[PDB]
Design a protein around this ligand. Structure first.
Ligand SMILES: CC(=O)N[C@@H]1[C@@H](O[C@@H]2OC(C(=O)O)=C[C@H](O)[C@H]2O)[C@@H](O)[C@@H](COS(=O)(=O)O)O[C@H]1O
Ligand code: CA
Length: 474
């Protein structure tokens, strides 16, 4: 009756193996997954950390933080995969032969492969988030598109104060985000100010975003915008339904979010909110700086086979199934005759995905059947092109043609001892950044008074050492 245990979460949800996509993989592979993440869990980091203190690791370990996952491999919790691939995973073997660049994302410094990344279709679509504004609200209030951060401030104030949704209530939420943890909340707020909450490249050197003066300015500005009601008062708690809720109730004025799914709302709300026009704009300029650091990475997270799995050969065959023509189509597009049909050998989505009766993104519908569930699969840009609006496709080209996107820093790989030390310092600093950034934005601490002590705290945790490690690995 053999069960396969897994730890898998994504976007705050424990994987449900009864979703249509995984029922089909179960039928095709004979693998019956049982999640050791339970259905009430939503914090993937605390769940993972807790799972490690179990007795046994589950057979398959999926995690979004790939440096942590690779450290589990280095420590022996995840087994090397390269011989299992070479002998039992022909689709993966072919994928790695055909894509050496992607193969290097998977190979650790000691030469073993401890995880299959979940790859984006990066050499086809490299942009990710873009800035959007309610063009219909600008028009109703007689305003031009703001082009700098200060004009955006004035525009958001006017959205807040001048009832652009026309209902006689002071209900507007001028700028909002969509995220399921603090780092991703900060990701969609500090880039406005040319800052970053993570590591980034500056002229061949690697630097920590939160330790920079542009991060202090971003936070101090956000704190002032928060006090004046220009950014959602619930930025940190609203969760992943923020965008659906704020847009569909005609409260949200502007955001920074993934281009294809944010572009889906014009069609989706066309009847419910006449004239709704949430429109992509180039990143607002800050003293002539036109750049954004929103770019797709080559992969996100991954999964590996634990040292405690009884049957690693049947598990590597499961990993491989997702790389056949059919398994990769299943993962990306969902079920034939439900989410898509074949027209000339190629999938065309149905109205269930493209014209959801209740206002759902096409991507939201696809995720409800288990498509696009981050594990260790290979995204296919044709799935995204199959539901992306014409304004989404023009949007990608808009950001590329204007050269506003700075490439993401690769996630770097380190030797055994440095890798353990880097992830330890990086995680401890991340906690400090998220604690202080919240207090400063929410108004319970004063950034001007506390910034220097905050810097000393990061330094005392090891900022210099992590920085040295990042620059050796670069
Ligand atoms: C690999 C994965 O599931 N990535 C998640 C992102 O998914 C992308 O979303 C879109 C889109 O237009 O929304 C297009 C891509 O095809 C799809 O991979 C996305 O859901 C983000 C949202 O995170 S957040 O912005 O920080 O909330 O989450 C990634 O995990
Ligand atoms: Ca109003």
């Amino acid at each position: 009756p053999k069960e396969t245990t897994i730890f898998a979460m994504h976007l705050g949800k424990a994987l449900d193996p009864n979703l249509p996509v995984f029922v089909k993989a179960e039928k095709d592979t004979n693998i019956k997954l049982v999640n050791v993440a339970s259905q009430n869990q939503t914090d993937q980091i605390q769940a993972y950390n807790l799972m490690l203190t179990e007795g046994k690791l589950p057979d398959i370990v999926s995690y979004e933080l790939s440096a942590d996952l690779e450290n589990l491999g280095i420590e022996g919790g995840l087994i090397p995969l390269e011989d299992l691939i070479n002998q039992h995973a022909p689709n993966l073997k072919k994928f790695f032969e055909e894509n050496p660049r992607y193969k290097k994302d998977a190979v650790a410094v000691d030469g073993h492969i401890y995880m299959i990344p979940n790859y984006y279709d990066y050499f086809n679509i490299k942009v990710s988030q873009g800035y959007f504004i309610r063009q219909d609200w600008l028009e109703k209030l007689g305003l031009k598109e703001p082009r700098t951060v200060d004009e955006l401030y004035t525009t958001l104030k006017a959205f807040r104060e001048k009832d652009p949704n026309g209902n006689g209530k002071k209900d507007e939420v001028p700028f909002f985000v969509r995220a399921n943890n603090v780092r991703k909340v900060l990701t969609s707020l500090v880039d406005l100010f040319k800052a970053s909450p993570i590591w980034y490249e500056e002229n061949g050197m690697v630097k920590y975003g939160p330790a920079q003066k542009e991060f202090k300015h971003a936070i101090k500005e956000l704190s002032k915008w928060y006090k004046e009601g220009l950014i959602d008062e619930e930025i940190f708690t609203r969760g992943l339904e923020s965008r659906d809720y704020l847009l569909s109730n005609n409260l949200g004025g502007a955001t920074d979010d993934w281009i294809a799914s944010t572009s889906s709302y014009n069609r989706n709300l066309a009847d419910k909110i006449p004239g709704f026009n949430l429109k992509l704009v180039l990143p607002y300029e800050l003293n002539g700086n036109a750049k954004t650091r929103h770019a797709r990475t080559t992969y996100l997270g991954g999964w590996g086979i634990s040292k405690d799995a009884k049957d690693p050969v049947s598990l590597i065959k499961y990993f491989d199934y997702w790389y056949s023509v059919e398994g990769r189509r299943l993962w990306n597009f969902g079920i034939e005759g439900s989410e898509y049909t074949l027209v000339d050998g190629k999938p065309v989505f149905t109205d269930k995905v493209l014209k959801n009766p209740d206002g759902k993104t096409p991507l939201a519908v696809l995720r409800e059947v288990g498509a696009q569930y981050r594990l260790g699969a290979f995204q296919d840009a044709q799935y995204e092109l199959g539901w992306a609006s014409e304004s989404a496709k023009a949007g990608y080209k808009y950001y590329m043609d204007n050269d506003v996107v700075l490439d993401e820093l690769p996630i770097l790989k380190y030797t055994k001892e440095k890798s353990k030390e880097f992830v330890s310092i990086d995680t401890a600093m991340r906690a400090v950044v998220e604690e202080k950034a919240q207090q400063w934005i929410l108004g319970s601490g004063d950034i001007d008074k506390e910034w220097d002590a905050y810097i000393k705290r990061l330094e005392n945790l090891g900022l210099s050492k992590a920085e040295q490690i990042q620059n050796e690995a670069f």
